[PDB]
């Protein structure tokens with residue numbers, strides 16, 4: 196109505212953001228975080244590198260801060276992420292066979308247990324597949340453990356947390372293609388055999404002017420397998436600097452994404468990967484690309500803001 200939180204709340208869906216706990220000391224950042232979202236996810240604080248820097252030695256300070264923030268502001272807490280090929284410490288990469296599998300399972304158990312009852316959902320496994328279909332080719336988990344690591348990770352997560360929503364997350368799976376198809380088969384297989392799995396996340400790290408037209412259809416087929424779906428890391432990057440046309444297209448793109456979710460009853464909601472363009476991860480990875488978020492570098496609402504409110 197007046198804020199995006201109000202729009203999402205009124206719609207009965209979630210609208211979250213990727214939080215960097217250190218930014219909470221920046222008043223403006225905190226103000227927008229407090230009033231514009233009803234869900235929070237750690238942008239980096241709950242990743243392996245941030246939680247288990249050395250074998251069986253945990254660092255929960257940053258993760259705890261994110262969790263405390265959600266509880267203090269009354270927002271849903273989304274966990275990210277227990278098993279991922281990236282931001283994996285070297286000590287883990289140096290392990291093999293049973294040693295590596297145990298380190299993985301111990302990591303999953305310790306983190307899930309630590310945040311049990313606080314984190315409502317977990318990206319148990321992140322980016323297990325590859326563009327073009329099949330499994331990811333540069334993953335330590337796939338290379339050292341094979342196809343069964345995903346099931347192992349999920350069963351371990353349920354073992355630790357009996358009620359948390361266990362999700363599998365990925366990108367380039369927004370549309371119906373080889374990658375999402377392989378992801379589709381896995382989800383169907385898991386539900387078929389009783390492997391703990393409750394949700395599927397579609398990152399949605401999109402490019403301005405390029406939103407899958409079959410996004411809704413894709414979300415629906417997964418929802419129909421008996422699992423919830425969610426846009427987890429939404430941001431739509433453009434060639435910087437921005438201009439009127441790019442901002443208008445971006446706004447329209449944000450609208451399409453949110454509408455596709457609104458059109459699927461089991462789509463829990465949408466989470467944007469950050470608040471302001473001044474801290475977005477995009478520029479540092481894509482030279483000359485950026486302005487992908489809802490707020491600009493001066494915290495002024497971009498036209499994408501109105502588009503999101505409308506879609507909800």
Ligand SMILES: O[C@@H]1[C@@H](O)[C@H](O[C@@H]2Cn3ccnc3[C@H](O)[C@H]2O)OC[C@H]1O
Pocket residue numbers: 238239321366398400428476
């Ligand atoms: O600070 C950045 C984070 O923003 C970044 O988050 C990543 C973004 N991303 C793109 C594709 N897949 C993903 C991951 O799910 C998500 O964790 O990670 C790197 C940090 O330097």
